[PDB]
Structures are given as C-alpha cells and as structure tokens.
Amino acid sequence: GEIEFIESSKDAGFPVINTPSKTKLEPSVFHQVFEGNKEPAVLRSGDPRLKANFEEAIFSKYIGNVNTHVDEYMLEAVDHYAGQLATLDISTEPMKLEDAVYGTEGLEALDLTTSAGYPYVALGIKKRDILSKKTKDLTKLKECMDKYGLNLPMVTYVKDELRSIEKVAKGKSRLIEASSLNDSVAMRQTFGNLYKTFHLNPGVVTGSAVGCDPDLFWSKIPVMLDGHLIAFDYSGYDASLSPVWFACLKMLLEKLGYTHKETNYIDYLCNSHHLYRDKHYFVRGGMPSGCSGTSIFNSMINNIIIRTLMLKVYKGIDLDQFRMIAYGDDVIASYPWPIDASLLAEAGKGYGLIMTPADKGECFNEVTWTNATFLKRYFRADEQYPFLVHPVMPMKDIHESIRWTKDPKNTQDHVRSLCLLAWHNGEHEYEEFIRKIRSVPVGRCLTLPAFSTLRRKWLDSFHHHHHH
Ligand SMILES: [Cl-]
Ligand SMILES: [Cl-]
Ligand SMILES: [Cl-]
Ligand SMILES: [Cl-]
Ligand SMILES: [Cl-]
Ligand SMILES: [Cl-]
C-alpha cells in the first residue's frame, strides 16, 4: 500500500477531524499489584516518551506496491481456495437490511459504540442518533444513506491500546479506519451472507478463524492440522498488501458468484480516500483495517498468498494436502512434509510482503505443538482428557491487561474476562492470580469464578451441539 496524494483538508472543504489526543487508558487499581512493561500507545506528536518522529512512524507501514499482474502462481492459488469455498454454498444474495444492521445468526448487530465515520463525526451525529436496538428502526438510516450516499471518505484514527516499551519509543502506534456508517451498511448487505458463513465455519475449509471461540476451537485445530506445522509472522501485513492481492481477491469472489459490480466494494478498500485530523489523502493498495469485513478479507487474501508462495517455491507441492487457518495476518498451517518457511518469506518479499519467524524468533525454526501460538495463545492438551486442548494465554499478557483500564466502571467484566483466560494456565497459576486480585479491596468486591466452576463449565461446553 502507498500514499499517493496528500492535501490540507480545508483546501477541499473538509473540517478537521478532532480525534482525541489523550489516552482513555489509566492505571487500574491492579497496576501496583501486578508487573508489566506495556503502556498506552503514543497518540500525539508531542508525547514526551517518543524517541522517533510520530507521524513518520505511524504512516511507515505503507511500504509501497509491487506493480505486477496476477501471475500463474496466484491463479492456481485462487482456483484451489475457490474450490474449498464452493463446498460451503455461500449465498451471494444481499442480506436483508434489518439482518445486516440489527443482528442475525452468524453476524452480530452493527456495533453502536464505534465511530459512525464521515460526515457524521463532523456533525456530532452518533450511531445511536440514527439506530435503535429497541425499535430496530431503519427509517433514519435510510434517510441518511439516501442523503449522503456511498463511497465516502474513511476517518483515520490512531488505535488507543497498550504497546510495548519499544513500540512506544518508536511511535509505532497502529492506525485504524472508520468506514462511514453508510459504507459499513452497504458492505454488510453485500457480503453479509459470506460474513455469516465464515463466522459459522472457522477452520480449514474457510481457512479462517475469524469469530471463533478459542475455548472450543482449540481442540479442533490439531485435528485439522495433523502434519508438520507451518507458522510465521508478517510485519505490517495490512498496509503491505499491493493491489494485485485485491485483484486476486476480486477473482475469488467472482468465482463464488458475485458480480463485477458487487466486487466494486473491494476497489473502495484498495484505492481509498481518508481524513486524518487536518489532512485529506489518497492511498493505493493496503487493507484499511477497521472497515467492514477487513479481518475476513485479510484472511481470504492470506489463503491466496500462502498457496501462491508454496506453488512458487515448491513446484511439486500438492495443495490438497496443505491445510491452513488464518485470522487476518496470523496463520497456523500444516503440510505432510517439512517446509522451509525462510524460502517462502523470500518469495513473499518479491510480492511486497515482509514475513519473519514466528514469535519474534531469529530463525525460521521448527514449529512444534509446544511452541506454536495462534491469537497469541499456546496449545496445551488437557491432562485428564487429552483430546481437549486448552488455549493458553500467557500470564504475562493477562498481567499487562489487568494493570490498566479505559473505564473502571467495567472492572467486574474486565476481570471476569481475564479469569476465563487465566485458568487455562493451571490451578496454581490461577489461585495466585486470584490471591493477587484480592490483595486490594476492589478485588474482594468482585464475583470471580472458582477454578472448579471454570473447569466444569469448560468440560460441559463440548456436549452441546453447535450450528454450522
Ligand atoms: Cl505479576
Ligand atoms: Cl481506539
Ligand atoms: Cl469456534
Ligand atoms: Cl504489531
Ligand atoms: Cl518441489
Ligand atoms: Cl462444534
């Protein structure tokens, strides 16, 4: 992806986006109880913790585009992945407006707490001024969609979230885009049934983990990925995506039955128009993280990419024996023979992708079930029921999170969520976590689950049929 034109918003009539410059994250009551090194990401140029130029750092993931046609390797990769998606019978019929906005099976209701985007943010109009959970009203939304139309600019925000010491110093904060509520809605109507099918079918057929529930999904992953594991990381995946990958994504959707006009929303994601504070700018390529379906589309593109690199490097590869699960840029895969991921990374480099060893490793080492992570979690077979696998979020990450809060009024939900993650680390680690939480009075005012209750409910959850 690459920035192709920048101008002062005022020269084109756009008001300045007044995005917050101070973090909503504050030290929590547990900040002194636990240890951690993460702090709120830099959100402004003047931050005294900066040791690099902010604006440069944040826009630096737009490394450029490789200007290639869709090649032979890509074509066979698209064909192979479209073959799997076909078995799913994804409907390309538009999703009914109410289902798209207010919720339905496999597609939760449009989040009413995130940004309504442009022009709404400039007019003080919030999602809640247009939409209503209670009434399921759509009259105002339609007026809005008619008045302002589609293909509106995206609003660029810096993500307010915890980051490592090094990422704070380098100003390596992440950008997310707020699609206008009008474009979000039209995209959810166009691709909603695909979103739903993906959400209801995480695994090796969609090759996606988007919307999965790790507590349940983890036990399936080693059944799906039964050969020699493959895993690696990308650096700045989203912004590194060149248009050619979007061209491949468009071919894939057309094989699935979408019309050319329906895939036009892919051009909206690829060749995009943004407002960032007092600037207005155009970008060619790069997935604009935050718009409707970005995790799904990023995942689909990853499926095309990896197949492409294997076909390119291993001419004798048999893709029917390859398996992979992606969550955006995060991937866990397998093949019955060993595969040299450093080779794939060099092939990726020719395609404008930056792949590195898994987990900040220095070498494309062997990935084992002991060292593999996905969604940051390790895999550990239950001792009593070996066919059940615990998703293991490291205690270090749980500690980083508990030390800060964006709203202490939600302490109970925040802590309870962390407890659902923590117990997988074992009974002793869990009792220690609980003991430390209760070492401050707030900790004793909370309803925290018992380990035996967590374990029991986890074992029982595998008994109840799940719709696909
Ligand atoms: Cl600690
Ligand atoms: Cl944010
Ligand atoms: Cl799941
Ligand atoms: Cl990162
Ligand atoms: Cl080969
Ligand atoms: Cl299931």
Side-chain angles (χ1 to χ4, degrees), residues 310 313-317:
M310 303 244 83
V313 177
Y314 294 86
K315 263 72 181 200
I317 206 82

Coordinates of all heavy atoms in Angstrom, one line a residue, residues 310 313-317, ligand 5:
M310 N 3.8 -21.2 -1.8 CA 4.2 -22.6 -1.9 C 4.2 -23.1 -3.3 O 5.0 -23.9 -3.7 CB 3.1 -23.5 -1.1 CG 2.9 -23.1 0.3 SD 3.4 -24.4 1.4 CE 4.9 -24.1 1.5
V313 N 7.5 -21.7 -4.8 CA 8.8 -22.3 -4.3 C 8.8 -23.8 -4.5 O 9.9 -24.3 -4.8 CB 9.1 -21.9 -2.9 CG1 10.3 -22.6 -2.3 CG2 9.2 -20.4 -2.7
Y314 N 7.7 -24.5 -4.3 CA 7.6 -25.9 -4.4 C 6.7 -26.3 -5.5 O 5.5 -26.6 -5.3 CB 7.1 -26.5 -3.0 CG 8.1 -26.3 -1.9 CD1 8.1 -25.2 -1.1 CD2 8.9 -27.3 -1.5 CE1 8.9 -25.0 0.0 CE2 9.8 -27.2 -0.4 CZ 9.8 -26.1 0.4 OH 10.7 -25.9 1.4
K315 N 7.3 -26.4 -6.7 CA 6.6 -26.8 -7.9 C 5.9 -28.1 -7.8 O 4.9 -28.4 -8.4 CB 7.6 -26.8 -9.1 CG 7.6 -25.5 -9.9 CD 8.2 -24.4 -9.2 CE 8.2 -23.1 -10.0 NZ 9.2 -22.1 -9.5
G316 N 6.5 -29.0 -7.0 CA 5.8 -30.3 -6.8 C 4.8 -30.4 -5.6 O 4.3 -31.4 -5.3
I317 N 4.5 -29.2 -5.0 CA 3.6 -29.2 -3.9 C 2.2 -29.7 -4.2 O 1.7 -29.5 -5.3 CB 3.4 -27.7 -3.3 CG1 3.0 -27.7 -1.8 CG2 2.4 -27.0 -4.2 CD1 4.2 -27.9 -0.9
Ligands
CL5 CL 9.2 -29.1 -5.4

